[PDB]
Design a protein around this ligand. Structure first.
Ligand SMILES: *[C@@H]1O[C@H](CO)[C@@H](O)[C@H](O)[C@H]1NC(C)=O
Lengths: 48, 47
């Protein structure tokens, strides 16, 4: 009757890779509605 | 193409029961990148 969850053990003594890492996945979808999010469109100085 | 565009105008008037005999051009208010099909609409009134 095992439990499907296990509580992580993260003591500051532990070695690299045994240590906790914070992770984020960036994901997206395309080509079905207009692009609401985009990279920064840089601008130069203006000459006249 | 997935944009929903609103244009509008205000004018003052003084009339009892019809749309007025004048020409006025609606300016764009806003463009909304909503991406969704529209086939029907409804309006909301103060009770
Ligand atoms: C919008 O409606 C059309 C026609 O039924 C359909 O082909 C299209 O997949 C719809 N788009 C969305 C985002 O539901």
């Amino acid at each position: 009757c095992y439990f499907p969850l296990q509580s992580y053990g993260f003591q500051p003594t532990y070695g690299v890779g045994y240590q906790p890492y914070r992770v984020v996945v960036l994901s997206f979808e395309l080509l079905h509605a207009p692009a609401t999010v985009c990279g920064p469109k840089k601008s130069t100085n203006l000459v006249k | 193409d997935g944009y929903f565009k609103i244009y509008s105008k205000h004018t003052p008037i003084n009339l009892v029961r019809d749309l007025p005999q004048g020409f006025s051009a609606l300016e764009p208010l806003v463009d909304l990148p909503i991406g969704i099909n529209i086939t029907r609409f409804q309006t909301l009134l103060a009770l």
